[PDB]
Ubiquitin (Homo sapiens), 144 residues
Amino acid sequence: MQIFVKTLTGKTITLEVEPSDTIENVKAKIQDKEGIPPDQQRLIFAGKQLEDGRTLSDYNIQKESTLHLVLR
Amino acid sequence: MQIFVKTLTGKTITLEVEPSDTIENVKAKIQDKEGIPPDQQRLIFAGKQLEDGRTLSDYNIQKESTLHLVLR
């Protein structure tokens, strides 16, 4: 399924993922596309910070869901 | 003395500093805690941008003062 990630600068990125994909895997996909190291990235969905040891399905993230990316 | 630094994402960081500490030293402390390189950080206090060659006392920053961090 496709998901969207918005940046602090107003950019939107589209990613192809599976509900069984891990958050760490998602961060890795972002690194590949934007060059941002996973340790400097924070992912938020519906006001909650997503953990690297959990999956998309655990957060009930559905197709065309939009995640927010924060930089540290 | 303790000071506070707020981020663009709404996070607040507490740092231990001395009035004789330099702004560059303060940035270095932030790098250690957040991983943000000093060249990408801008510190603002009471509407003024702080320079790397000046100290906290020069800006009359007192205990429990709150600084604002900007990213470039």
Observations:
- The domain at 1-72 of chain A is CATH 3.10.20.90 (Ubiquitin-like (UB roll)).
- DSSP finds one helix and five strands in chain A.
